[PDB]
Design a protein around this ligand. Structure first.
Ligand SMILES: Nc1ncnc2c1ncn2[C@@H]1O[C@H](CSCC[C@H](N)C(=O)O)[C@@H](O)[C@H]1O
Ligand SMILES: Nc1ncnc2c1ncn2[C@@H]1O[C@H](CSCC[C@H](N)C(=O)O)[C@@H](O)[C@H]1O
Lengths: 234, 234
């Protein structure tokens, strides 16, 4: 009963060809494709076969998402769900999973290249430098939505190791405040990547002091990955 | 002068098909392939064309590695260098880079799926759970080689968020000590993945108290990715 099956595909950072081999194969053969997220390309979007039912989720509600996927499955069809990057990182795949596995689905997750990785790449930075830092911290700035209590950016910034920030592009005023309160220099390097591996990509290199200016002058207000730390210097 | 060029390819966690699309294309057309690391499959190894000169590096010394690559380049040949996972994470690509760019090379890095990601996948864990934790910490246990001072595992374990440990498989006695000294419960979940996405893979799920036993009973002494934290529970 291999229709009863979810694949969760990691679609890569943006470029159509950072999709693993296997991710591309599935994507090709799926009958219903669910692209949650507007952070996939029109061009990933467009390799599924002709036929495919395509659906946007995100603005859909748990239980509806889930039942649509169960209906299609019952139907004998091949469903797949397409997350940007690697689903394990701020994917939200957990709750669907558990509903799903109750109705016996099998899951299969198909890892991805996360945009962390794509940003470092663009810049040509390893994130780990012997003697310098051996830790990379991947988190998000608190905005409205507060973060758990022992995870604040100030306190995660006191190990001084490379910090890589998802969903924070328009919180660079907090970002600098917490870095300075954990006592980073105002000179430590920042690099921002804007749509990495998109044909619109922008690479901004800058520093804690200028962050917010850099952002707002480059007009990067979304999709940007911010690496901050002395491994991004030279 | 597009022979003067390094691609740094991320080869994925193990399976031949977690290699991005583009990584596979390069790998196909390269004249000299440099696989540093014995952590690639015999089967990635084996898609390069017939012809290819294949070289193992690692036990080679900086400047030799570099000059061999420059000689081949001069020669008009297509070189590529194949790191496991994503090179940005404990890649060591930095020093080659800089020598290289001096002799004017261009680099191109081709991101990857890092084994972080592959482990979470196998287990079916998102690493980020709203209300639970929003931070994933990627580091390594200190062995002989000490880690920088503000990065110790105890102190990185006091945010209580998912911690993912590369190269520490045979340091699970320190691992439990530092987790317990940062006051984790002895019950918080551990999952180890052993050769993830290899055909030998092993998934061990266990807890801080049993870690070291789990390891030594499963006999996992190498290639293992250890995720530790309440998102790996259920
Ligand atoms: N191509 C891209 N360029 C840079 N960052 C992007 C990006 N796509 C993903 N992001 C980041 O990811 C956030 C979406 S959260 C989804 C992230 C994802 N699962 C991944 O693994 O990459 C955005 O705020 C930005 O922080
Ligand atoms: N398939 C695999 N299974 C689990 N972990 C592995 C692995 N391959 C990489 N590792 C980990 O990576 C360490 C090598 S350091 C190289 C890691 C790499 N650049 C990556 O991105 O995945 C090993 O100690 C183990 O900690």
């Amino acid at each position: 009963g291999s229709h009863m099956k979810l694949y969760i595909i990691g679609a890569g950072p943006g470029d159509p060809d950072l999709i693993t081999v296997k991710g591309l194969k599935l994507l090709q053969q799926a009958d219903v494709v669910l692209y949650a997220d507007s952070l996939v390309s029109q061009d990933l979007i467009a390799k599924s076969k002709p036929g495919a039912e395509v659906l946007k989720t995100a603005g859909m509600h748990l239980e509806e998402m889930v039942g649509t996927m169960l209906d299609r499955m019952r139907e004998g069809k091949m469903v797949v769900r397409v997350h940007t990057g690697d689903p394990a990182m701020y994917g939200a795949i957990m709750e669907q999973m558990v509903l799903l596995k109750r109705e016996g689905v099998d899951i299969e997750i198909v890892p991805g290249v996360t945009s962390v990785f794509a940003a470092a790449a663009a810049a040509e930075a390893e994130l780990t430098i012997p003697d310098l830092t051996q830790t990379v911290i991947l988190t998000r700035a608190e905005g409205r939505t507060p973060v758990p209590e022992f995870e604040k950016l100030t306190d995660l910034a006191k190990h001084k190791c490379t910090i890589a920030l998802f969903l924070s592009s328009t919180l660079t005023k907090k970002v600098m405040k917490e870095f300075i309160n954990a006592g980073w220099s105002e000179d430590t390097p920042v690099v921002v990547v804007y749509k990495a591996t998109w044909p619109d990509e922008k690479i901004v290199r800058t520093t804690v002091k200028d962050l917010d200016d850099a952002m707002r002058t480059n007009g990067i207000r979304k999709q940007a990955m911010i690496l901050a730390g002395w491994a991004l210097d030279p």
